[PDB]
Amino acid sequence: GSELSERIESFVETLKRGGGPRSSEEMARETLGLLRQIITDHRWSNAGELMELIRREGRRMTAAQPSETTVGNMVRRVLKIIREEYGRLHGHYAQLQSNIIEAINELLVELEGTMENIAAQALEHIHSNEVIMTIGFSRTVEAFLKEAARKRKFHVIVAECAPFCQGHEMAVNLSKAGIETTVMTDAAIFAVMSRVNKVIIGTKTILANGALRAVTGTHTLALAAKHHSTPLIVCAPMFKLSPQFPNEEDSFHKFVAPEEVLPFTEGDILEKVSVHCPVFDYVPPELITLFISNIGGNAPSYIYRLMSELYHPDDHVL
Amino acid sequence: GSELSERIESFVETLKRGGGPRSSEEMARETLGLLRQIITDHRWSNAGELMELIRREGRRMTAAQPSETTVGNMVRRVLKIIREEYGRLHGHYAQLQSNIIEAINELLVELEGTMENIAAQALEHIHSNEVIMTIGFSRTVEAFLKEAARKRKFHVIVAECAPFCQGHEMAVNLSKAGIETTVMTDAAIFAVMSRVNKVIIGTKTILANGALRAVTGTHTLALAAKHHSTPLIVCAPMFKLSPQFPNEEDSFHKFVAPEEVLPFTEGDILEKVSVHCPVFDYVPPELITLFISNIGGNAPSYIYRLMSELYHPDDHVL
Ligand SMILES: O=C(COc1ccc(Cl)cc1)N[C@H]1CC[C@H](NC(=O)COc2ccc(Cl)cc2)CC1
Secondary structure, X not given: OHHHHHHHHHHHHHHHHOOOOOOHHHHHHHHHHHHHHHHHOOOOOOHHHHHHHHHHHHHHHHHHOOOOHHHHHHHHHHHHHHHHHHHHHXXXXXXXXXXXXXXXXXXXXXXXXXXHHHHHHHHHHOOOOEEEEEEOOXXXXXXXXHXXXXXOOEEEEEEOOOOOOHHHHHHHHHHHOOOOEEEEOHHHHXXXXXXXXXXXXXXXXXXXXXXXXXXXXXXXHHHHHHHHOOOEEEEOOOOOEOOOOOOOOOOOOOEOOHHHOOOHHHHHHHHOOOOOOEOEEEEOHHHOOEEEOOOOEEOHHHHHHHHHHHOOHHHOOO | OHHHHHHHHHHHHHHHXXXXXXXXXXXXXXXXXXXXXXXXXOOOOOHHHHHHHHHHHHHHHHHHOXXXXXXXXXXXXXXXXXXXXXXXXXXXXXXXXXXXXXXXXHHHHHHOHHHHHHHHHHHHHOOOOEEEEEEOOOHHHHHHHHHHOOOOOEEEEEEOOOOOOHHHHHHHHHHHOOOOEEEEOHHHHHHHHOOOOEEEEOOOEEOOOOOEEEEOOHHHXXXXXXXXXXXXXXXXXXXXXXXXXXXXXXXXOOEOOHHHOOOHHHHHHHHOOOOOOEOEEEEOHHHOOEEEOOOXXXXXXXXXXXXXXXXXXXXXXX
16 A cells, blocks of 8 residues: 555655665666566556556656666566566456566566576687776676686776776776776777777667667777777676667766766866766667677667567557 | 890899899899999990980899889989989089999998898887787898897787798797797688787888788788778888889789699699689788888878989889
C-alpha cells in the first residue's frame, strides 16, 4: 500500500537529487525490484491496465532524471516481458502474474551475470604487451582489464576526465592488480594516441543509431582513434541499450554546476563569462569498431536488431 | 685520350649490364670522377662546348640505364656547377677549369659526408621502446638505425622484398648491433601496421613532385602508414634528387627477368601466363611525412625548392 508509494517516491527523489545507487547495475537491480513490487502490490486484472500504470510510473521516473536511461529502458524491458507473456497466454490471471514474476526473476539473475560474462569474454581481445587507452571510470572496463591481466601483460593509459577526475581512481584500481598504468590529462589524448593499440571505454547509454552517450571528452578520443585507425571497443552490458534515437529525443547532455569547471573564487569575471560543464557527450556510430556485451561481440550495425530483440517498437515513447 | 674513351665505355656497359658499383654512393663517386676526367682530358676552351659534350655523354649514360637516375642527376649537378662558375667569371680559361675542378672536389668531399650527416641526425628522431618498420635493404637506413641504437632501445620490423629478399640481410645486419629485429613477409605489412610507430625507408630516386621511386611494395607500405596515420620517414641523401617529374618521363619501372617471380621449372603454364616483376614503384608525395637529408629534415613540399637550389631548369631534359 503506502509502503509501495513511499518507496517509489524515495526512489524518484533519489534519482532526481543525486546518483543513487552509484553503480548503474545496482540501479537496474533496484528499478527491477521496484517494478516487481508494483506489479505485485496493485489490483490489476487485465494486462492492459498493468501496462498503463507501469507506463505512467515510468514516465514519472524518466521525468525525474532523463540522463539516467537505464531506469527507462529497463521499464521498457518489463513492458516487453508483459507483452510477451500476454501473447503467450492469448496467442490466466494468477498464472499471468506469477509468470511475469518468474520472467523478472530470470531477467534479474541474468542481470548480475553480465559483469562476469564480459570479464570472461575479455581474454580473447587482449594480447601480450598491448597498449590500451581508456578515459574516465567504468566498473565494467576495469573488470575487463583486470580479468585480462591475470593471463596477459599489457599497458593501460587512463585519460582523466575533467572536471570529475574519475580516471584517477580507475588508474589506482588498475595499478592495484599490477597493470602498468599511465595517468594523463585528457588534453594529451591525441598526443599519445599514436602509440596506442586499442581503445576500451564504457558508456552510460547506447542509442538505436548505434551511437553512445558517454562521459565528456570520449568523442574526442573516438575521433583520435578514427584518425589513427585504432580499434575502439565499447564494453557495455545489455541494460544500457536505449531504443530512443539521437535527435528524436530531448535533454541529451547533463549539465552540472559550473563550479566544477571554474570556481567561485574567481570573483567578478564570473558575472561576465558563461561557463558550461557538460558531463555526457555524443559519439556517432562511425567511430566505434566493436561492441562487447553479455551475449558476445557485435558491430554497431546490429544494435537495431538487438533493439528489436529487447524493446517493443510501440514502447519507444513510453 | 683513348684511356678516357675506354673508361667511359667500361662505365657505360657496367651500368647497362648489371649494377656496378653496388652502392649508389659509390656510383655517384665514380660518375663524378669520370666527369672530372672528361672535363680535364678534352680540348675545350669555351664553357658552351664543354657543357655540350657533357650533355651528350650524359645522354649516352642515361640511355645506358634509365632507372639509375643518380648518374644523370649528378651530371646535371656538374652542369649547374659549370653554369655557376661561368656566371661568376662572366657576370678566365685556365682559372675556369681549375675552379670547376675545385667545385667538383668540394662536391665530392661533401658527398661522403651525407652518410655520416644522416647518421648523426638519426638520434633526434628515435625514442626509447619505439617500433620501426622498414622494407627491403638500404645502407642509409641501416646506418640511421644502428646509429640511433647506440643510445636508444627500439624494435625494427623488416619487411622482406619479394622476389629479391634484400630485407633478410638488412635484418641480419640490424641484429648484429642488438637491434631487436622482426623479419616478415611483405604480405604481412598491413596486418602488423597497427602496432608500428614510424616507417623509415630509403629510396632510389626522388622526383620533383616530391614522390619517390623506391623498391616495389613500398607504395603499399606507405598506403598502410597513411591509413594508420603513422609518420613515414625517408632517409635519402641529396644525390638521389631527380629534377624530372613523374609522368613527363619515360621508363619508370625496372622490369627484370620473371624467373625471379615464377621459376622456369613450372613447365607448360609458362607459355600461357604473363609474369611481371617490377623492381621499382611510384609513391606519391601525399604519403610521405618527412624527408631526411644531409642538410636536415624537410617536408615533401620543399623538394621543388631543393631542385631550384641544385639543378638549372633548362637542364631538366639533358
Ligand atoms: O612500453 C610500452 C608503454 O607504452 C606507453 C606507455 C605510456 C604512454 Cl604515455 C604511451 C605508451 N609499450 C610497449 C608496447 C609494445 C612495443 N613493441 C614491442 O614490444 C615489439 O613490437 C612488435 C614486434 C613485432 C611485431 Cl610483428 C609487431 C610489433 C614496445 C612499447
